């Protein structure tokens, strides 16, 4: 009811047991070491909460709905902001010298990784055991986003036929440029965009995570980002990329901390790679 | 054993959404809870550091180079944590006021720990965040025991070199400032008749009045009792000495301490300001200096040309 | 070519230390120069973005969604640049007081030291107070505030004939206040009950004062508010319906205007702080948008859409 | 006075020529692109100013005079703060969409040399190790011939009081304490001990150091490394507080410049190797602290 009965501070604020103190030689900085990681864990729980809620919204199948889409983008943004905070939080442990850590590491143990972070990685998902396993079997954010991308309106060959026209369009462009560098190299690539074999194979090699159709949808959102009906979807893509990056920045920081104290596989990678397939503006079919 | 080690069975089983318990789960309540729990963890950390620093002072031996180094490093740490706590407002900013009021069915904001913190520093009563509800004992100790302000004051008062039959810093300073002011006036008088001059003379009179006012003990006593200053006159002299001789080996680290204190004051103000804003944004219609170390902030006011500063030995 | 494209022959030959010119080189003067040159580059950028936005508004057709996007994105950009200019203050902090005093005199006189571009910026926003012509134009042409006002005044839904947002809102607020009063007076006498009565009294007042055109007229005349009553209704409509798809972007715009006001005011504050430290001797334009939060009502009191 | 004149704004604020505009198709975001890089160049000039002053201070001797040493640390710190700002400045170009960029990408440079002269100069003076701009190149050459920051810091480190084998004999004592302590850990006890033994004892292999040095996997002279390790271990000591601050600054600069160099290319793709490594590696030779030689 009242803070911090409401916040259960009897739990939160009585969960700090210094090993060094327990083993007769209290070390001041160990407290900081505990608090930093407990804070990391709290935010990990919050991120899991937001992420799982988004996952359900997708799973419920009404994601395309503009209200639901807004909720999703909003919560993903929240996850990104939390992640920036966590990246910034390393500055705290930077104020601990490696010596003062040595005065204590010794009551420490090797197996020093977060379960919650593992769960997080799974659900995203990157390439108590019931929770871990459940996180491994249930649908990842990547899969759900892939599904959503696959169902992007405009891909219908008979309808908008985005993929066909684009392809013809690039071609006329390649031809038009050839007659009037060093060029072929972009070419090598633009045309390669239409090589299902290369995409599936690279998919098997793990250099891509999205299905071919999903990639087509993603590229459609990319190209029509300025159109009204695509603003928020593009925001979602941006958010996914950002969360990716930040998760990478965090691992990296995390490791640094351990060497200092001791003696791109990324999952929306396809989204990041969208830029390589950038084309002159007119090569894009009129949208109305 | 990262779990048992971090007692996550406590930390990660302290998230009870009231809205969910009373049948109408509101998603953002979880965020509200987590953010405040994180704040509380860091308040615990800051109180840990601050209490350790206070003890170091109280023991005497603060001046010993090792101990002073400890103190400065931990105060710096507190500063860093505070910067993080300020950035943490960006999280709750991602929460809309209506979704808040979806769950705001429970009882009014304030942390006991934050109150202990303000007391220890310690802020004056007009200005602390509202807190009215074992613990009370704690609180009482926090109001009686010596604050960081008092201890730092004690420390400043004993700044070696303030004694008249030694360096006689204060006497020398009054002399050099008076002389310099006198020289400055001569400097102006030599100029042609404007347009600048008046600019020059006006600033001269303002500076003269401020700088000389520094040597008026009774005025200081007056401002002190009115609460526009917090440090004793002698303590102020010490601070000013550290301020002026900061580059000298024996003053680099003390000056770091001063900078840290000002930083902590600034950040705590910033935090309190962000906090208050949230309540208002969250409450809306229903919502209805100040720096402990204000004197250190005002040190810059008594800045004088380098040559007026008494030479060292 | 880089240097040619960026005209570094100009940019990188514009650093003349007075202290050196007058025989006594002072190392920190260079930093003092560079920081301010960087400031002015960014002010030129901000003026570029801002003027393009003002022009889009002035033309009518702000509402066409592409144009609305141009405006929102560029105003956002201004917000980001201003965040950077605020963080840039950390640089000038690295410079000690004594040392600045080592070179200041070459600077005197201080009232000399103010940016034309920063005032152009303020004019065009606009704060309430050869180059003189540029300044004059900025004084005569329409400010971002007036244009935003015009746009808000034109919000769809305020028509008393149509949706009647304001009419509906008064009715819903009045009714809701009556009901809330009855809910409260029905409680066991208490501690809690007392608090709720007070909160009701203020809430009641703030909410009802919202419909007092004359108070708004009055506050306008004192400058304690800047927007017309009608524009204010518009802003409030955007505010209450912010979650709705068609109001997402307008609200983004409002948020950006608030940020720009905050950040700009912060830069102004910080800046003089330094002049104060170096010498030893609130948020302006869009206050109405800042005050939007005070008028929040319970979700069910908000008129349903059509 | 006047502010406008003092800053030479007549140059700074008339240096913005949009190529897209010059060629009849003005593109709005091109202006942002130009201003961002001009701001980068301004700060680079500041960094070169600070850096050259620090370098000179080292070269003029009397670096050890605490006054000048303070100057060096504060200015190196300043360079660090500037670089943090430059890192945040990428947020500005992040407000430029790949489409809008692509609208003006065609008008320049092309490149290849769309890189800063000043940034290369800075790399040289720091000591970054391994394309035509004519007037300049001699200037660059001069940056290649004059002493790098790395070299001066190396010299400074070699002179660290305590290394002398007369007088404190830091390195020998260190060897004694580590060897004995390693024997004692050997007896008081699986993999980590043999690993720690290998790295810690290899610390005393001058030839391995010269080898790694010739390969460029280390940059400091062996003796310089001894000085650095001494500063590292005795950091709490009065005469080492400021030196350690300097080491920290150098590492920070190395980190930030890396961060910057990385972002200037990650964005080039979005639109289209450590100098003080030894200081970073100091942590690897961390030891229990009983083992650190007692100090005077």
Three-state secondary structure along B31-46? HHHHHHHHHHHHHHHH
Contacts of C6 (CB under 8 A, 6+ apart): D15, D34, D37, D38, D41
Partners of B247 on chain D (C-beta within 8 Å) are 67, 70
* Chains contacting A (3 or more CB pairs within 8 Å): B, C, D
Gap between the Cα atoms of C71 and B46, Å rounded: 44
Domains and CATH numbers, chain D: 1-164+204-296 (1.20.58.480), 165-203 (1.10.287.3810)
Q: DSSP letters of C73-117?
A: HHHHHHHHHHHHHHHTHHHHTTS-HHHHHHHHHHH--GGG---HH
| Residues sharing a CB contact under 8 Å with residue D268, sequence separation 6 or more, in sequence order | none
Consult the annotation and say whether C35 binds a ligand. Answer: yes
Query: Whole-angstrom Cα distance, residue A36 to residue B48?
Result: 13
- Please indicate if the annotation marks D33 as binding a ligand: yes
CB-CB neighbors (< 8 A) of D37 in chain C: 2, 6
- In chain B, residues with a C-beta closer than 8 Å to the C-beta of D241 are 69, 252-253
Nearest-CA distance from D283 to chain C in Å?
29
Under 8 Å CB pairs connecting chains A and D tally to: 36
Closest residue in chain C to residue A69, using alpha carbons only: C245
Distance between CA atoms of residues D226 and D164, nearest Å: 11
Burial annotation A53-71 (CB, 10 A radius, 16+ → b, else e) = ebbebbeeeebeeeebbbb
Return d(Cα B267, Cα B82) in angstroms, integer: 6
Q: Considering CB atoms only, which of D13, D46, D77 is closest to C44?
A: D13
H or E element, residue D51: helix D30-59
**Tally of residues, chain A:** 288
Find tokens 């009065």 and name the residue: D238
CA distance D21 to C5: 13
Question: Which tokens is D203 given?
Answer: 């610390």
**Chain A residues in contact with B113 (beta carbon < 8 A):** 13
Pairs of CB atoms within 8 A across C/D: 145
| Residues of chain B with C-beta less than 8 angstroms from the C-beta of A49 | 30-31
After what residue numbers is chain C broken, C–N > 2.5 angstroms? 129, 281
How far, in Å, CA of B44 to CA of D163, rounded?
44
User: A-chain residues within 8 Å CB-CB of C248?
Assistant: 70, 232
- From residue C124, alpha-carbon distances to B285, B287, C67, C81 in Å are 32, 34, 20, 17
Which of D3, D43, D91 minimises the CB distance to C34? Answer: D43
Joined tokens for residue D46: 């500041």
Q: Which residue of A has its CA nearest to B107?
A: A2
Pairwise CA distance, residues A92 & A253, whole Å: 12
CA angle B204, B206, B209 (to 5 degrees): 105
CB atoms within 10 A of CB A39: 24
> Among candidates C193, C191, C171, which has minimal Cα distance to C183?
C193
A132 and A119 Cβ atoms separated by less than 8 Å: yes
Cβ within 8 Å, pair C281-B207: yes
Residue D36 known to bind ligand: yes
- Asked, as a colleague might, if the bond just before A4 is cis with ω within 30 of 0, I would say yes
- In angstroms, how far is CA A78 from the centroid of its own chain? 13
Best of D1, D69, D70 to substitute, by most chain B Cβ atoms within 10 angstroms, is D70
CA-based nearest distance C245→chain A, Å:
7
Judging contacts by C-beta atoms under 8 Å, the chain A residues touching residue C249 are: 231
Is C76 annotated as belonging to a binding site? no
Mutation target to probe the A interface, by most A beta carbons within 10 A, among D28, D102, D248 is D102
3-state SS string for chain A? CCCCCCCCHHHHCCCCCCHHHHCCCCCCCHHHHHHHHHHHHHHHHHHHHHHHHHHHHHHCCCCCCHHHHHHHHHHHHHHHHHHHHHHHCHHHHCCCCHHHHHHHHCCCCCCCCCHHHHHHHHHHCCCCHHHHHHHHHCCCHHHHHHHHHHCCCCCCCCCCCHHHHHHHHHHHHHHHHHHCCCCHHHHHHHHHCCCHHHHHHHHHHCCCCCCHHHHHHHHHHHHCCCCHHHHHHHHHHHHHHHHHHHHHHHHHHHHHHHHHCCCCCCCCHHHHHHHHHCCCHHHCCCCC
Q: Cβ contact (<8 Å) for B285 and C277?
A: no
Residues 6+ away with beta carbon under 8 Å from A99: D286, D289
The CA distance from A142 to A144, in Å, is 6
Looking at chain A, after which residues does the C atom sit over 2.5 Å from the next written N, breaking the chain?
110, 127, 180, 263
Is D35 labeled as ligand-binding?
A: yes
d(CA A282, CA A169): 9
Technique behind this structure? X-ray
Single out the residue of A28, A12, C13 nearest to residue B35, CA to CA: A12
**Torsions phi, psi for B166 (to 5 deg):** -120, -115
| A154 touches A160 (CB < 8 A) | yes
The rounded distance, in Å, linking the Cα atoms of C113 and D70 is 30
Residue C69: list chain A partners with CB under 8 A.
226, 231
* Chain A residues with beta carbon closer than 8 angstroms to that of C247: none
Cα nearest neighbour of D200 on chain A: A263
Tokens 């008092």 label which residue? B150
**Tokens 């810091």 belong to residue:** D153
Resolution (A): 2.9
N- to C-terminal Cα separation, chain A: 56
For residues D270 and A271, is the Cβ–Cβ distance under 8 A? no
* 8 A C-beta contact, residue A84 and residue A48: no
Distances in Å between the Cα of C117 and the Cα atoms of C42, C128, C129, C136, D4 are 10, 16, 15, 13, 10
Q: Which of A65, A68, A225, A231 to mutate to test the interface with C (most CBs of C within 10 A)?
A: A231
Q: Binding site annotation covers B34?
A: yes
Of C47, C2, C40, C88, residue with least CA distance to D12: C40
Annotated binding site of A for heme: 254
Q: What DSSP string describes chain B?
A: -TTTTTTHHHHTT----HHHHTT---TTHHHHHHHHHHHHHHHHHHHHHHHHHHHHHHHS-TTSHHHHHHHHHHHHHHHHHHHHHHHTHHHHTTS-HHHHHHH--S-----HHHHHHHHHHT--TTSSPP----HHHHHHHHHHSPPHHHHHHHHHHT-TT--TTTT-HHHHHHHHHHHHHHHHHHHHHTS-S-STTHHHHHHHHHHHHHHHHTT-HHHHHHHHHHTS--S-HHHHHHHHHHHHTTTSHHHHHHHHHHHHHHHHHHHHHHHHHHHHHHHHHHHGGG-----TTHHHHHGGGG---GGGSPPP-
User: Which region, left, alpha or beta, applies to residue A193 given φ > 0 means left and ψ of -120 to 50 means alpha?
Assistant: alpha
Question: CA-CA distances (angstroms) from residue C98 to B304, C12, C279, D77?
Answer: 8, 27, 10, 18
Q: Write out the residues of chain D at the interface with chain A, using a CB-CB cutoff of 8 A.
A: 97-99, 102-103, 192, 195-196, 199, 235, 269-272, 283-284, 286, 288-289
> Cβ neighbours of residue B164 under 8 Å, at least 6 residues apart?
B170, B171
User: Are C72 and C253 in contact, with CB atoms under 8 Å apart?
Assistant: yes
For residue B110, cis peptide bond before it (omega within 30 degrees of 0):
yes
Token digits of residue A252: 């990296």
CA distance D217 to D238: 32
Lookup: tokens for B78:
């507190």
User: Closest approach of chain C CAs to the CA of D3, in angstroms?
Assistant: 5
Chain A residue closest in CA terms to C65: A228
Residue A218 CA to residue A271 CA, distance in Å, equals 7
């Amino acid at each position: 009811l009242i803070y911090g009965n409401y916040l259960h501070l009897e739990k939160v604020l009585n969960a700090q047991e210094l090993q060094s103190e327990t083993k007769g030689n209290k070390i001041h900085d160990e407290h900081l070491f505990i608090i930093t990681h407990q804070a990391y864990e709290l935010w990990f729980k919050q991120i899991l909460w937001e992420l799982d809620s988004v996952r359900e919204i997708f799973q419920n199948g009404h994601v395309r709905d503009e209200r639901n889409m807004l909720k999703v983008v909003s919560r993903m943004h929240r996850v990104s902001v939390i992640l920036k905070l966590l990246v910034q939080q390393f500055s705290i442990l930077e104020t601990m010298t490696a010596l003062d850590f040595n005065d204590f590491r010794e009551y420490l143990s090797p197996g020093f990784q977060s379960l919650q972070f593992r769960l997080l990685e799974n659900k995203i998902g990157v390439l108590e055991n019931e929770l871990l396993l459940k996180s491994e079997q249930e649908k990842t954010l990547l899969e759900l986003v892939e599904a959503w991308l696959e169902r992007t309106p405009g891909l219908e060959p008979h309808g908008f036929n985005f993929w066909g026209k684009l392809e013809k369009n690039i071609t006329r462009g390649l031809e038009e440029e050839f007659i009037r560098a060093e060029f072929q190299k972009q070419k090598e690539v633009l045309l390669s965009l239409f090589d299902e074999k290369r995409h599936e194979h690279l998919l098997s090699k793990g250099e891509r995570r999205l299905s071919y159709r999903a990639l087509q949808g993603a590229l459609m959102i990319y190209f029509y980002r300025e159109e009204p009906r695509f603003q928020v979807p593009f925001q979602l893509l941006t958010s996914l990329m950002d969360i990716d990056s930040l998760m990478t920045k965090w691992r990296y920081n995390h490791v640094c901390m351990v060497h200092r104290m001791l003696g791109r596989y990324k999952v929306f990678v396809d989204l990041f790679n969208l830029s390589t397939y950038l084309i002159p503006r007119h090569w894009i079919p009129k949208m109305n």
